Amino acid sequence: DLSQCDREPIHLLGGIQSHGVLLAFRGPDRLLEVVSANAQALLGRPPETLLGQPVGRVLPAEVLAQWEPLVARGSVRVVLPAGAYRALLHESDGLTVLELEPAELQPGMEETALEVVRRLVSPLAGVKGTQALLQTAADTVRALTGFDRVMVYRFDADWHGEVLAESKRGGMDGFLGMHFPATDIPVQARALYTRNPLRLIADARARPVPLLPPVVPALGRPLDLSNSALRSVSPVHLEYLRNMGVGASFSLSLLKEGVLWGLIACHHLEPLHISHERRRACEVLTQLLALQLSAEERAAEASEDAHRAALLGQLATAMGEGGTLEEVLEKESERVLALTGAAGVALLLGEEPLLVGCTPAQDEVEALVAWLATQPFQTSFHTDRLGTVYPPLAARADVAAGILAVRLAPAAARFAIWFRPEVARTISWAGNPRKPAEPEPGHQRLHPRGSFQAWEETVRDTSLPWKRADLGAAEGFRGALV
Amino acid sequence: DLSQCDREPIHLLGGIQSHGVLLAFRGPDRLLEVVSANAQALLGRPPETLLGQPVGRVLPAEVLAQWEPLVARGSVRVVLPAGAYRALLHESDGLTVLELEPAELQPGMEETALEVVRRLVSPLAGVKGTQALLQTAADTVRALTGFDRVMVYRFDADWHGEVLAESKRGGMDGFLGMHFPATDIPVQARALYTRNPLRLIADARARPVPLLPPVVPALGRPLDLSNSALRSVSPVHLEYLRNMGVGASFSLSLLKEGVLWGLIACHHLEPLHISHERRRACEVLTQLLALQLSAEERAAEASEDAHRAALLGQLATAMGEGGTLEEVLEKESERVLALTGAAGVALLLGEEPLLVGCTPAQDEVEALVAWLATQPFQTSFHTDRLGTVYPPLAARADVAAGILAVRLAPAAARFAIWFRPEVARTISWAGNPRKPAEPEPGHQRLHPRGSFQAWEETVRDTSLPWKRADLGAAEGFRGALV
Ligand SMILES: C=CC1=C(C)/C(=C/c2[nH]c(/C=C3N=C(/C=C4\NC(=O)[C@@H](C)\C4=C/C)C(C)=C\3CCC(=O)O)c(CCC(=O)O)c2C)NC1=O
Numbered sequence: 001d002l003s004q005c006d007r008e009p010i011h012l013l014g015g016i017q018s019h020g021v022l023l024a025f026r027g028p029d030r031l032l033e034v035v036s037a038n039a040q041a042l043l044g045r046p047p048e049t050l051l052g053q054p055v056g057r058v059l060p061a062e063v064l065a066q067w068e069p070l071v072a073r074g075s076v077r078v079v080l081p082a083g084a085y086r087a088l089l090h091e092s093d094g095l096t097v098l099e100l101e102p103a104e105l106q107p108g109m110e111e112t113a114l115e116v117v118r119r120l121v122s123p124l125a126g127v128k129g130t131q132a133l134l135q136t137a138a139d140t141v142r143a144l145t146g147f148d149r150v151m152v153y154r155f156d157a158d159w160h161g162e163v164l165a166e167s168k169r170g171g172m173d174g175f176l177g178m179h180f181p182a183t184d185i186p187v188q189a190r191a192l193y194t195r196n197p198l199r200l201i202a203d204a205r206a207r208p209v210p211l212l213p214p215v216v217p218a219l220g221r222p223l224d225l226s227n228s229a230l231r232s233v234s235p236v237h238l239e240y241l242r243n244m245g246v247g248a249s250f251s252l253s254l255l256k257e258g259v260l261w262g263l264i265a266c267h268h269l270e271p272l273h274i275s276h277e278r279r280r281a282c283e284v285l286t287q288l289l290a291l292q293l294s295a296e297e298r299a300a301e302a303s304e305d306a307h308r309a310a311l312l313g314q315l316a317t318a319m320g321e322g323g324t325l326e327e328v329l330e331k332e333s334e335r336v337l338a339l340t341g342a343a344g345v346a347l348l349l350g351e352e353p354l355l356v357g358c359t360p361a362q363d364e365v366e367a368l369v370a371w372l373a374t375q376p377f378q379t380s381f382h383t384d385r386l387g388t389v390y391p392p393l394a395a396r397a398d399v400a401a402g403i404l405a406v407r408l409a410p411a412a413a414r415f416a417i418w419f420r421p422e423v424a425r426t427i428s429w430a431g432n433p434r435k436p437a438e439p440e441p442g443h444q445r446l447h448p449r450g451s452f453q454a455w456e457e458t459v460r461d462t463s464l465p466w467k468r469a470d471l472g473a474a475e476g477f478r479g480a481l482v
Numbered sequence: 483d484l485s486q487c488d489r490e491p492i493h494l495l496g497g498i499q500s501h502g503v504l505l506a507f508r509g510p511d512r513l514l515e516v517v518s519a520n521a522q523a524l525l526g527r528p529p530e531t532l533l534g535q536p537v538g539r540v541l542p543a544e545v546l547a548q549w550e551p552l553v554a555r556g557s558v559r560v561v562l563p564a565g566a567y568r569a570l571l572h573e574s575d576g577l578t579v580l581e582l583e584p585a586e587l588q589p590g591m592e593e594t595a596l597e598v599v600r601r602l603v604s605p606l607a608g609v610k611g612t613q614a615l616l617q618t619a620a621d622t623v624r625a626l627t628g629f630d631r632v633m634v635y636r637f638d639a640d641w642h643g644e645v646l647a648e649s650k651r652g653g654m655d656g657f658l659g660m661h662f663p664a665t666d667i668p669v670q671a672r673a674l675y676t677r678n679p680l681r682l683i684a685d686a687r688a689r690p691v692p693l694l695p696p697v698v699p700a701l702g703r704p705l706d707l708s709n710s711a712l713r714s715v716s717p718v719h720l721e722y723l724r725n726m727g728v729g730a731s732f733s734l735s736l737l738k739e740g741v742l743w744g745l746i747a748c749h750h751l752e753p754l755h756i757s758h759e760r761r762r763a764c765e766v767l768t769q770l771l772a773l774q775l776s777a778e779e780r781a782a783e784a785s786e787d788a789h790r791a792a793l794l795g796q797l798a799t800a801m802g803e804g805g806t807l808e809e810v811l812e813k814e815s816e817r818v819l820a821l822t823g824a825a826g827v828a829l830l831l832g833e834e835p836l837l838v839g840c841t842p843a844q845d846e847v848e849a850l851v852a853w854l855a856t857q858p859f860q861t862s863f864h865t866d867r868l869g870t871v872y873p874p875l876a877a878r879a880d881v882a883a884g885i886l887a888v889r890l891a892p893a894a895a896r897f898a899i900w901f902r903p904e905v906a907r908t909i910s911w912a913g914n915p916r917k918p919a920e921p922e923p924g925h926q927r928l929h930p931r932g933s934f935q936a937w938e939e940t941v942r943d944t945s946l947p948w949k950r951a952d953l954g955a956a957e958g959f960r961g962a963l964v
């Protein structure tokens with residue numbers, strides 16, 4: 001991939017966060033093969049002395065007492081001299097991996113979680129826009145977590161993102177409405193965050209605890225920490241958080257029909273650890289949000305489709321009525337433009353173009369037609385920045401920044417072309433997107449950018465996007481023109 | 483017709499169930515106005531002596547201590563000498579109504595409930611049919627409640643219902659696939675269950691506890707118990723449960739888009755109390771099922787619409803390619819029938835009725851064509867039981883149990899008419915639906931039927947129902963033809 005940013009093997013860094021301990025066992029005897037260097041902080045004896053020992057000799061009695069429920073269901077609460085810990089089991093590189101993390105301290109956590117679950121699963125959740133849906137998701141994640149700032153971050157189609165909603169405590173910086181470069185979350189991280197939907201950075205200023213030995217002996221590379229709850233994250237991201245002034249970070253993947261739609265991102269000014277069970281309660285919330293957004297969005301498309309079909313039905317009724325085609329198309333101009341949310345339409349029915357509403361002049365349309373006929377499309381063609389692909393009209397963003405053309409005949413030049421003007425857009429980036437990172441001389445060590453202050457950009461020469469309903473309506477109009 | 487069943491005022495029966503206590507207070511001194519006759523077991527004094535007393539002198543300190551969160555939140559847990567009770571507050575008839583019932587005793591209840599909530603969100607529940615979505619909902623409610631039998635009951639358009647899914651104890655009888663008369667849940671019950679979505683019948687053999695006095699003195703009728711958790715239900719429904727052999731019953735209304743879609747109904751063979759907290763956890767599951775059903779239904783309808791529009795788009799290509807309409811329509815014969823899932827179609831392009839596939843004879847179609855013009859519809863007409871509306875073809879259920887017609891011109895009678903044959907359906911009723919009740923001589927006392935054994939009816943002369951995708955595709959074909 002492109003940058004060095006994509007290259008970092010973030011699952012193979014060999015470090016865990018200092019609040020927990022990791023032990024990896026293999027074979028029928030469960031011999032300890034990999035252990036974190038801090039494992040005396042919970043186990044009494046120096047970790048290097050425990051490599052190669054059977055599990056029954058390294059683990060405390062309190063954990064061994066819970067060994068059967070641990071293996072059975074992969075997660076158990078254990079009470080140690082150092083306090084209550086959550087034990088977690090997964091498999092990686094042929095090893096059984098055991099992680100221990102401080103356990104939830106509030107007995108009423110699940111009751112509180114079930115209550116905020118109600119606030120989001122309730123019907124009527126969305127009855128002032130999906131914006132109120134996102135705001136409620138952010139508010140309830142903040143209530144359950146205690147984090148200073150909770151943001152809903154949506155990926156655009158180039159994988160840069162923007163903050164759509166935000167819940168933060170009074171008197172605190174926010175990022176609402178700002179855009180962030182795709183490189184802020186590089187492609188291997190997005191990959192990992194698609195299969196591992198949660199991640200906690202409990203203290204952005206702490207140093208990672210290394211694993212011992214620093215490679216798995218059979219493999220000659222570090223233990224694969226893809227599914228580790230304790231995995232220490234990229235040093236470059238830790239720098240990024242410090243540059244933002246955040247001491248703890250917790251984010252959750254928003255998966256909507258298989259793809260990474262966005263994130264719920266949380267920041268705290270100070271270190272803060274959330275328990276495993278509290279993180280899993282937060283993940284229920286995000287899966288509810290994904291579900292509410294799908295149902296709302298499909299309802300919106302259906303309503304839009306119904307509106308287009310009503311327009312088509314009225315056009316059909318006006319046909320099969322009086323006069324010629326050009327006459328009914330004259331009377332029904334506003335419906336024909338409304339079909340695709342357009343400001344003008346060129347109808348090429350054989351003679352000269354029929355120009356309805358706001359369109360470029362006849363000579364320019366006939367020229368556009370000559371060129372569309374050569375293009376490699378089948379029934380529909382659309383673009384929201386015509387000037388990039390057809391520079392003869394690149395100056396005419398006022399009437400022809402976007403077009404939608406349907407072919408009305410097989411091997412002949414018969415078309416309906418709808419036009420849209422540009423819509424200027426003011427983007428506010430969190431820092432200068434032209435310098436998304438700060439490499440050292442030589443370009444071997446990368447740093448995050450230093451500032452996230454607003455940096456404004458205006459986008460010109462692009463129309464509103466051609467949406468699914470526009471495309472469906474154009475096909476319906478084609479079928480009516482035969 | 484408003485039988486005896488529909489007129490019983492089930493919210494004004496004046497009784498509560500024996501496992502709880504109800505008090506109602508009025509005015510700023512909160513004087514006791516109504517009280518259940520069993521209240522000595524909680525108040526220490528005979529209830530008649532407490533009427534007219536201020537709340538501060540009827541309620542133990544334990545309840546008064548929590549008055550403000552009770553008023554703000556509507557429920558609190560209070561620990562009394564008898565044990566832990568849930569206190570529930572609402573307003574009725576200008577009185578403050580207090581209800582007390584035994585509280586949840588399992589500390590881990592909310593943690594278990596959060597675990598079954600995850601089952602119903604998961605990645606994508608219902609990947610193998612909404613049938614498995616309904617099953618998972620019955621299974622999780624049964625797991626959370628411990629009821630012997632849990633059933634998903636859907637209302638049909640005539641408000642009779644059928645059991646679509648069932649989760650039950652081993653060796654238990656069931657009602658899967660069976661149909662029940664609409665009078666089993668009469669119209670005022672359906673109305674109440676739209677407003678109050680939960681109801682528990684903890685012991686179907688127990689007798690109701692009367693309220694004291696039997697009327698609200700200001701009003702001259704019983705206290706309105708619409709929103710009471712302890713309300714004793716209709717005596718004829720208690721007889722219905724006993725005829726079924728059930729000792730306890732619990733049901734949740736399924737509201738999908740504001741309308742009563744169905745019920746999750748639970749039966750226990752012995753008496754069984756479920757706490758308020760546990761009932762509210764079940765309500766989360768039902769609102770989750772409703773949300774899942776809407777998301778999947780909207781997806782299925784979008785997918786069907788997409789198929790119909792592909793069919794129309796192939797019809798458009800074919801017409802813009804060939805000469806004769808009747809030739810293209812002949813060549814494309816089965817796409818034209820697939821449009822509405824039909825077995826024949828009559829195309830009235832003026833001259834001779836063109837008949838494709840499986841249709842009535844030319845004389846017979848010209849007959850219903852003449853009848854169709856003088857009917858009150860603008861663009862489309864459809865029925866799935868043509869014989870009951872147009873007797874000349876009642877004997878032709880083999881080709882024309884259902885029709886769908888669109889008008890291809892305003893004045894004059896140019897139509898396209900799709901035809902469907904009957905589909906015979908075998909439905910099993912729970913008891914003979916001709917005797918849905920057993921009235922006594924004089925027809926003033928009604929009883930429910932005594933038997934629920936399968937009673938089998940085959941429905942004839944009706945097609946598969948015309949769906950919204952069918953109507954949509956026909957409208958699109960109309961636009962392609964005028
Ligand atoms: C409000 C907007 C907002 C945004 C847009 C935001 C970004 C964000 N980045 C990450 C993670 C990573 N970033 C990078 C690399 C680079 N980042 C750069 O700028 C350049 C210099 C670069 C490389 C050259 C890597 C390798 C990882 C994976 C770390 C790991 O998992 O090991 C995360 C998830 C972790 C978390 O929740 O804190 C988030 C949420 N956090 C916010 O709040």
Ligand SMILES: C=CC1=C(C)/C(=C/c2[nH]c(/C=C3N=C(/C=C4\NC(=O)[C@@H](C)\C4=C/C)C(C)=C\3CCC(=O)O)c(CCC(=O)O)c2C)NC1=O
Nearest residue numbers: 487492662666667671715716719731732733747919929930
């Ligand atoms: C497997 C399928 C299945 C069905 C289809 C089913 C029916 C059902 N009925 C009810 C309630 C009532 N029924 C009646 C009246 C009559 N019932 C008759 O038969 C005739 C004689 C009649 C009048 C002449 C009234 C007034 C009420 C309101 C009671 C109240 O709230 O006060 C309920 C809710 C309560 C609950 O979950 O147990 C259910 C779930 N219960 C099942 O499991």
